[PDB]
């Protein structure tokens, strides 16, 4: 990869146009000073072992799980943050839809995907801790929140937590990024009322 | 899974038809749930869904007249639909979906309903 | 919204037909959430396809879809007496809708 990382290709990251059917790698070599990681601040949990699996795959679709437009009940296109421009406009992730609440209402997302596909699917989404009780209500009205994310082998139950961080490029909350392998057949299950950062795109997956 | 629709088949013009549909053997958690029209000899029409936990969407045509609702713990959910008229006369069908199936995989059987006095 | 249909489609037992729908952007063509289903009268219509080209059962072993712009086509093989109904092609929109064709009966042609 030129300037991104892996955390950056696969999240959509405006900066990185590496996309498609991206050909058949024969693995990846990438910076370890990757130029552009995530928009936000933050941590991608268990980067290692992601590490690890796409060092055995070698071909990627992507496809469509959710559209974004089915968040008729939130805002989906206000979610956009200088941290990362597309050109000189404050932009965010592609793959991932940060909701925001429409009409100071945030409704109770409680949604399930189901893998129809032959190939498995690499799933992505994100929690957001915000910087104040203020920035809280103002994103999500609903000041105590939850992510609620299942599948037959994966169970998460988050709380994020109001906390005043250090800025890192012009902001005090940060974004834990997670992910999974979902089988076909088996379906993912998402429920929440805040903060949740939502899968848009996901990708098709064969091993060795 | 088996759906099935339950109401008054028989509606007086400019009151409300009310239906419900009740689901057996699954829940109605983290599906998309749809209610369809097909008035007789014509062509199916999408009137709008209920997902999430209780959010809804409804055809542009109708909307103002349409209020789709859910009861988790008796696992139906319903419609209504306000000042009726001869146009409404149709064959109404309930109907779960999923994403990933991103259609409507299992139906109801229908049920008649007709607006006369 | 209705997406555009043929009303009427005729073939004899055994040779392969085809059904058209077309829509625009904001449905057929930006998403892959094209559906169809077959209709007999006086019953509930059948998923017989979903997202564009795949077959919930071995029901749909002669069934096969495909999309081309903002058209999109139902094939079926082999054309047996019993295929005779109404099928209607859905799509996804980007209201967070669906909406349906007109419907195309399927004519037996003895």
């Known amino acids: 990869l030129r300037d991104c990382s892996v955390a950056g290709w696969l999240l959509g990251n405006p900066m990185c146009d590496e996309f498609i059917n991206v050909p058949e790698w024969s693995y990846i070599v990438e910076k370890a000073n990757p130029a552009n990681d995530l928009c936000y601040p933050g941590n991608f949990n268990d980067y290692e072992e992601l590490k690890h699996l796409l060092s055995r795959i070698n071909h990627f679709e992507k496809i469509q799980i959710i559209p974004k437009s089915s968040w008729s009940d939130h805002e989906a296109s206000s979610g956009v943050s200088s941290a990362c421009p597309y050109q000189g406009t404050p932009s965010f992730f592609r793959n991932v839809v940060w909701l925001i609440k429409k009409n100071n209402t945030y409704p109770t997302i409680k949604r399930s995907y189901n893998n129809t596909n032959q190939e498995d699917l690499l799933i992505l989404w994100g929690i957001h801790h915000s910087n104040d009780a203020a920035e809280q209500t103002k994103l999500y009205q609903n000041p105590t929140t939850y992510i609620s994310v299942g599948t037959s082998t994966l169970n998460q139950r988050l709380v994020p937590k109001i906390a005043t961080r250090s800025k890192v490029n012009g902001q005090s909350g940060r974004m834990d990024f997670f992910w999974t392998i979902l089988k076909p057949n088996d379906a993912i299950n998402f429920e929440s009322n805040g903060n949740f950062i939502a899968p848009e795109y996901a990708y098709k997956i064969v091993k060795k | 899974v088996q759906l099935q629709e339950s109401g008054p088949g028989l509606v007086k013009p400019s009151e409300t038809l009310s239906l419900t549909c009740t689901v057996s053997?699954?829940?109605?958690?983290?599906?998309?749930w749809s209610w369809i029209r097909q008035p007789p000899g014509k062509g199916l029409e999408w009137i709008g869904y209920?997902?999430?936990?209780?959010?809804?969407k409804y055809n542009p045509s109708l909307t103002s007249r349409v209020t789709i609702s859910v009861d988790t713990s008796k696992n139906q959910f319903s419609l209504k639909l306000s000042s009726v008229t001869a146009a409404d006369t149709a064959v109404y069908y309930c109907?779960?979906?999923?994403?990933?199936?991103?259609?409507?995989?299992?139906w109801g059987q229908g049920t008649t309903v007709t607006v006369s006095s | 919204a209705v997406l555009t249909q043929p009303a009427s489609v005729s073939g004899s037992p055994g040779q392969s037909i085809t059904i058209s729908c077309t829509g625009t952007?904001?449905?057929?063509?930006?998403?892959?959430?094209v559906s169809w289903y077959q209709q007999h009268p006086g019953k509930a219509p059948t998923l017989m396809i979903y997202?564009?080209?795949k077959r919930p059962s071995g029901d749909s072993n002669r069934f096969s879809g495909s999309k081309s712009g903002n058209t999109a086509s139902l094939t079926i093989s082999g054309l047996q007496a019993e295929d005779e109904a109404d099928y209607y092609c859905?799509?996804?929109?980007?209201?967070?809708?669906?909406?349906f064709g007109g419907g195309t009966k399927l004519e037996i042609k003895r």
């Open positions: 109907a779960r979906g999923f994403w990933g199936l991103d259609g409507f995989d299992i």
């Open positions: 053997g699954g829940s109605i958690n983290s599906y998309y």
């Open positions: 209920l997902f999430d936990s209780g959010s809804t």
């Open positions: 952007s904001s449905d057929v063509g930006d998403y892959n959430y």
């Open positions: 997202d564009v080209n």
């Open positions: 859905s799509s996804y929109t980007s209201s967070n809708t669906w909406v």
